[PDB]
Design a protein around this nucleic acid. Structure first.
Ligand SMILES: [Mg+2]
Ligand SMILES: [Mg+2]
Ligand SMILES: [Mg+2]
Ligand SMILES: [Mg+2]
Ligand SMILES: [Mg+2]
Ligand SMILES: [Mg+2]
Ligand SMILES: [Mg+2]
Ligand SMILES: [Mg+2]
Ligand SMILES: [Mg+2]
Ligand SMILES: [Mg+2]
Ligand SMILES: [Mg+2]
Lengths: 127, 287, 59, 64, 95, 52
RNA sequence: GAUAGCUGGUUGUCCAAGAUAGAAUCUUAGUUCAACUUUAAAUUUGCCCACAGAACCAAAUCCCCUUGUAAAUUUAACUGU
RNA sequence: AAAUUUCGGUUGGGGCGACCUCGGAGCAGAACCCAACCUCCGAGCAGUACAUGCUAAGACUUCACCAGUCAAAGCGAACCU
């Protein structure tokens, strides 16, 4: 009805569509969502890694080899992250972690090293 | 109750049976007596008895405590730092549940002031209302919300529920007029036109991330999909709903009132509106 | 110590969710929060928050 | 700065019954008896200690 | 101090306190240790670090500063971006 | 006896610090740790503003 | 109706609690802080405590469980010393 | 030659003489504590690096405040009296 001076139609004569301003990986239906407060909410996510159709074979193999502590007894990559009061931030952090894992798959320890070296040295025992 | 049963008796309650609440009217304490005399609760000789002590904060002459501390720009530009009253998502849900601020109409500042959800004040360097991400969960409103400030978290929380988040800027005079439009109309002046933000808010309002009224409208779905992929939740196509034309209203700039336009003159008595004729007036108002 | 053979045994000839530990340390001391710290820095209030995020009452 | 109590400002009818009910309901929460202070005049009631959420839940369960 | 003004007939706030202190809704007064900008070459690093940190006020000092101010300064401060936004409200306290 | 001069930083402009030096000796060019670059850099004194 | 660290005075009945280490101050005839004292309130430990513990160039003192007790910390006030 | 102002404090009464900030020895002998016109010894600094860098749990604290003192860690280099 009314049209001001700096209306949206005049500021940008290219995208003048009235309904064009509301038009258009990691499937949500495949992943599981469940919360359990423990004072900070906890966003739990789980999904079968073997049947992950939305992940490539080498990426799945790398995720299963590296991130092995998160694998479930039934073959599910369980991961949780609780660092805020709201669950939306926790879900966003979990999604970002999943994306980082996928990307790095598509690509303190000195004591353990010394221990393994000493073990290998002591392994010397042949007839 | 027993109150009326007891009142049935006793004489009438005239003006002679009045008595204040025992413990409220503290008896006066005047200095006229043995205990309240001799010195009159003032002390021995000195300025205490004479009532002529130094100013407040004085410490006999030494550098007072409130001077020995150096200066600092704590409240330097405090008289100009923009301030907005917080608005929680839980507060919006409570308002929608209690009836006031119906979601069937745009959630403009006038509607919030009428419903009295966040009582703001035109004075006190206030230039609108901000948003808070308190009620991120258990929120289901679905309505075009208009707030000056808004974060990505709450923006997505509102969008996934079928809403439309937007941001605007109300000038001091425009904000005061929007706060109390009844006295503005009663004063007898034409509806002015809100000016543009300063250089500090131009880049903030000319971006599609925070949903601004001075950015490209084609970037809205891009930021929507970005926030969706960030926080999950598939975007519900608002184009395929029932209240599309109602939520499509964006309120063009230089328009203080969502319904009325600048230049028009409203009149309380005899509900009528005058047209701002004259080519010069129209050119100065809306070109 | 820990190894993959342990998990293999657990999931093969035990049939039970194996446990996991982390060795958690005791929480900090943090004495009784005084009303007027006087000489404490601005970080005094930071030791009693839950948690950093902007918390607002009702408005 | 120390004392902190709830206030049921709206009370109509027998206040002694409500006080006794609240006392019986709050006894298992602290073992002792809550120091109440009924006011027949102004239908009010004070209970030493914070019990806003618990009292609200109890009243909602009772149905008022 | 001026308990009563000569034009309107109200209290008056000493701008020195407002310039040398910072008001908070929690009821505490923030200040800055003196000597944080003079003779810094002879001060040991620990002293310089301790002097560059904020400090609170005592009960008597806080009450004096409050008396030297009006109710206008006790208003909230919902700044768009202020580093002291998470300090106006005090949480977790039991006497 | 020990003038207090300011040491200028070559790399990472905007960071300096003062040091002591005797009144009878060549200028100083000692190393110092910078906060911007987070590395050691040779400094150069310039402009004295003290006499003790 | 000037000011004045200074002299003088500051109106009826009765009940209760009610004596201070010091520092600064163009300051020791005056002021502030601290300390003593008063009011309403939330908390639990307040004092004599017993083995022991506490330095190279005499009467003593600090912590101190059971034991006598019911006193002590804090919050918000403010005059008085 | 006109116009405003002051002539700081201790002094076993006031001036004179001397002093005005801080550290130690006895008074103050065994946690702290206390007086100097009581008797003494010293200082407004002195020598090498410039990680004498950036951060931060908890404490002592000259009897108050302003002012001062120690510090697990965290990042960065190591293989002060
Ligand atoms: Mg009287
Ligand atoms: Mg002076
Ligand atoms: Mg007089
Ligand atoms: Mg005098
Ligand atoms: Mg006389
Ligand atoms: Mg008389
Ligand atoms: Mg008596
Ligand atoms: Mg002086
Ligand atoms: Mg004299
Ligand atoms: Mg002290
Ligand atoms: Mg270390």
């Amino acid at each position: 009805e009314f049209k001001s001076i700096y209306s949206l139609d005049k500021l940008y004569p290219e995208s003048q569509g009235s309904d064009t301003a509301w038009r258009v990986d990691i499937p949500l239906d495949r992943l599981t969502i469940s919360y359990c407060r423990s004072v900070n909410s906890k966003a739990e996510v789980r999904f079968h890694l073997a049947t992950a159709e939305w992940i490539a074979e080498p990426v799945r193999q790398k995720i299963a080899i590296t991130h092995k502590n998160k694998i479930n007894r039934l073959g599910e990559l369980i991961l949780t992250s609780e660092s805020s009061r709201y669950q939306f931030r926790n879900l966003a952090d979990c999604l970002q972690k999943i994306r980082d894992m996928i990307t790095e798959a598509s690509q303190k320890l000195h004591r353990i090293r010394i221990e393994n070296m000493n073990r290998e040295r002591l392994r010397q025992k042949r007839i | 109750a027993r109150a009326l049963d007891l009142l049935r008796g006793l004489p009438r309650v005239s003006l002679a049976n009045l008595k204040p609440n025992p413990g409220s009217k503290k008896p006066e304490r005047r200095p006229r007596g043995r205990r309240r005399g001799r010195k009159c609760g003032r002390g021995h000789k000195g300025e205490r008895q004479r009532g002529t002590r130094p100013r407040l904060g004085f410490e006999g002459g030494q550098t007072p405590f409130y001077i020995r501390i150096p200066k600092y720009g704590f409240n330097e530009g405090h008289s100009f730092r923009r301030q907005y009253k917080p608005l929680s998502l839980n507060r919006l849900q409570y308002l929608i549940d209690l009836g006031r601020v119906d979601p069937s109409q745009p959630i403009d500042l006038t509607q919030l002031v009428n419903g009295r959800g966040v009582t703001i004040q035109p004075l006190k360097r206030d230039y609108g209302v901000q948003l808070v991400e308190e009620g991120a969960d258990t929120f289901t409103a679905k309505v075009n919300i208009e707030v000056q400030l808004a974060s990505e978290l709450a923006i997505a929380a509102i969008e996934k529920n079928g809403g439309v988040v937007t941001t605007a800027f109300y000038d001091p005079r425009s904000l005061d007029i929007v706060c109390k439009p009844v006295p503005f109309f009663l004063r007898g002046q034409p509806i002015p036109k809100r000016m543009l933000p300063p250089e500090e808010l131009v880049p903030y309002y000319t971006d599609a991330k925070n949903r601004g009224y001075l950015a490209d409208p084609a970037k809205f779905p891009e930021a929507r999909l970005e926030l969706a992929r960030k926080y999950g939740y598939i975007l519900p196509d608002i184009t395929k709903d029932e209240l599309f034309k109602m939520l499509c209203t964006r309120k063009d700039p230089r328009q203080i009132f969502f319904g009325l336009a600048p230049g028009w003159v409203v009149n309380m008595a005899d509900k009528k509106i005058l047209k701002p004729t004259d080519e010069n007036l129209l050119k100065y108002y809306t070109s | 110590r820990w190894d993959d053979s342990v998990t293999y045994i657990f999931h093969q000839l035990l049939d039970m969710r194996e446990p996991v530990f982390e060795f958690v340390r005791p929480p900090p001391y943090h004495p009784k929060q005084k009303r007027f710290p006087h000489r404490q820095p601005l970080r005094y209030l930071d030791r009693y928050r839950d948690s950093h995020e902007p918390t607002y009452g009702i408005y | 700065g120390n004392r902190q109590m709830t206030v049921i400002r709206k009370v109509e009818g027998d206040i002694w019954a409500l006080q006794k009910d609240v006392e019986d309901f709050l006894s298992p929460l602290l073992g002792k008896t809550p120091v109440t202070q009924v006011n027949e005049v102004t239908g009010t009631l004070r209970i030493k200690g914070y019990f806003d959420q618990e009292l609200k839940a109890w009243l909602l369960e009772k149905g008022f | 101090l001026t308990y009563f003004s000569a034009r309107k007939g109200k209290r008056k706030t000493v701008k020195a306190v407002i310039d040398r202190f910072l008001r908070l809704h929690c009821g505490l007064w923030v200040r800055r240790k003196a000597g944080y900008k003079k003779k810094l070459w002879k001060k040991t690093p620990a002293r310089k670090k301790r002097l560059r940190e904020f400090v609170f006020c005592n009960k008597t000092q806080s009450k004096l500063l409050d008396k030297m101010t009006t109710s206008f300064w006790k208003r909230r401060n919902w700044y768009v971006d202020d580093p002291y936004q998470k300090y106006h409200d005090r949480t977790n306290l039991k006497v | 006896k020990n003038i207090l001069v300011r040491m200028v930083s070559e790399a990472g402009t905007g960071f300096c610090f003062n040091t002591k030096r005797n009144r009878l000796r060549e200028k100083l060019t000692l190393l110092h740790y910078d906060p911007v670059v987070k590395q050691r850099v040779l400094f150069v004194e310039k402009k004295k503003i003290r006499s003790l």
